[PDB]
Ligand SMILES: CCCCCCCC/C=C/CCCCCCCC(=O)OC[C@@H](O)CO
């Protein structure tokens with residue numbers, strides 16, 4: 173039942189929240205890295221605690237379920253993750269411009285992606301639901317474009333962080349593209365798959381996006397001399 177994956181996430185995210193803070197490197201730019209990558213699983217563990225106990229679980233007239241705790245989790249964890257990716261490109265340089273601006277612009281596009289994704293879930297099957305789905309994907313495209321074109325240009329102007337940035341962005345892009353696919357196939361969208369199947373896939377996605385990525389992103393940046 174759905175109660176099992178929610179508890180699994182709560183224990184995995186809470187334990188990983190401390191495990192990342194303990195094992196995470198506290199050297200220079202990596203200090204704020206593990207600090208942000210320790211808050212992300214702590215926010216997720218709190219959300220899985222809410223879903224497990226029913227805080228925010230909205231049920232519509234057609235039987236669809238909207239997890240308000242999940243989207244608030246995404247609304248704050250995904251901007252913190254992008255904040256660390258954009259900041260990692262500015263690592264080791266005090267002479268480059270746009271750090272505060274790029275983070276601000278990409279967080280705006282990410283929050284709109286998550287908020288409009290919440291409106292789509294709440295909407296019934298129709299035009300209103302899929303219009304905000306396409307507008308959410310449009311904002312997602314702007315996050316990816318910004319990540320790939322502009323801030324990789326900032327990383328490339330100094331090695332060897334540039335290959336470490338490109339490897340972390342490639343992992344994040346493939347991982348985050350799975351999320352809207354689960355939305356469409358699950359009850360929130362087309363309802364091709366059951367609600368419990370979406371909970372299980374989002375569990376493995378979140379563990380990959382918040383626990384596993386936190387350790388591979390650190391390993392890549394660890395090699396660069398900054
Ligand atoms: C790196 C890209 C991402 C890779 C991983 C992507 C897939 C992650 C998913 C993991 C498990 C998916 C399958 C989960 C299947 C769950 C089915 C289930 O609980 O059924 C309940 C009732 O319907 C029974 O009647």
Ligand SMILES: CCCCCCCC/C=C/CCCCCCCC(=O)OC[C@H](O)CO
Nearest residue numbers: 173174176177372373375376377379380384
């Ligand atoms: C390197 C680390 C990688 C970590 C990430 C890879 C994880 C692999 C997949 C696991 C998910 C398994 C999903 C199982 C879905 C069915 C579960 C089920 O039916 O549970 C029993 C039920 O609760 C009682 O009736």
Ligand SMILES: CCCCCCCC/C=C/CCCCCCCC(=O)OC[C@H](O)CO
Nearest residue numbers: 215218219222227228229240241244245248
């Ligand atoms: C330099 C600036 C740094 C700023 C750092 C960012 C702020 C961190 C915020 C975390 C919020 C965590 C919220 C966790 C929400 C869990 C789910 C929940 O509360 O759901 C309620 C439900 O919707 C009722 O029906």
Ligand SMILES: CCCCCCCC/C=C/CCCCCCCC(=O)OC[C@H](O)CO
Nearest residue numbers: 230247248251252255279283287290291294
């Ligand atoms: C780096 C940190 C970045 C932090 C960024 C934080 C952004 C928070 C988003 C706010 C959207 C608020 C409005 C969301 C839309 C309303 C959804 C809602 O509350 O729905 C209730 C439901 O319909 C009842 O039945």
Ligand SMILES: CCCCCCCC/C=C\CCCCCCCC(=O)OC[C@H](O)CO
Nearest residue numbers: 309310312313349352353356357362363364
């Ligand atoms: C650039 C931003 C990201 C862009 C990429 C993300 C959007 C993906 C969209 C569709 C995926 C396809 C989903 C396929 C769902 C099939 C549903 C189906 O066949 O439903 C049958 C029926 O509903 C039985 O009840």
Ligand SMILES: *C/C=C(C)/C=C/C=C(C)/C=C/C1=C(C)CCCC1(C)C
Nearest residue numbers: 246289308309312348351352355381
């Ligand atoms: C740790 C949790 C993560 C990384 C969650 C990510 C979620 C998304 C990238 C969701 C994207 C969506 C769209 C682009 C369109 C449909 C609505 C969403 C919110 C599922």
